[PDB]
Amino acid sequence: VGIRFCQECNNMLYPKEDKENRILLYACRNCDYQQEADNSCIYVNKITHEVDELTQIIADVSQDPTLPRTEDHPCQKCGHKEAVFFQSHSARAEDAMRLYYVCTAPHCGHRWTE
């Protein structure tokens, strides 16, 4: 999945085949540094990719003066009443109007979606 780098030349490690022990080795093209990986999966491609933005929503959006606010949706963690909300705010989304919420209490930053 991710990119792993050689410790000698600090270049990308390409996958190379070990035709003796039937094992996967990551080797670079600059030096002869070898490795054994734990992912065991070279490549992964998901075409749905309906990523939940709760990973990508920052908790600092609560300081936006231009966002709507509601008090009928208390925070799950700290029980604070006021909570900002907004829409998906994502391009390349075929169809979405679901709301997202962020707690406005400082240092809480709870970001959920009912």
41 annotated ligand binder:
no
Taken in order 51, 77, 114, 64, is the CA torsion positive or negative?
A: negative
Number of residues lying near Zn ion (CB under 5 A): 14
3-state secondary structure at position 100: strand
> From the list 57, 75, 84, 102, which residue makes contact with Zn ion (rule: CB under 5 A)?
75
The entry of Zn ion, other proteins, none that residue 57 binds, CB within 5 to 8 Å by partner kind = none
Chain residues binding other proteins by CB under 8 A are: 97-99
Query: Phi and psi at residue 59, in whole multiples of 5°?
Result: -75, -10
6 annotated ligand binder:
yes
Binding site for Zn(2+), by residue number, is: 6, 9, 28, 31, 75, 78, 103, 108
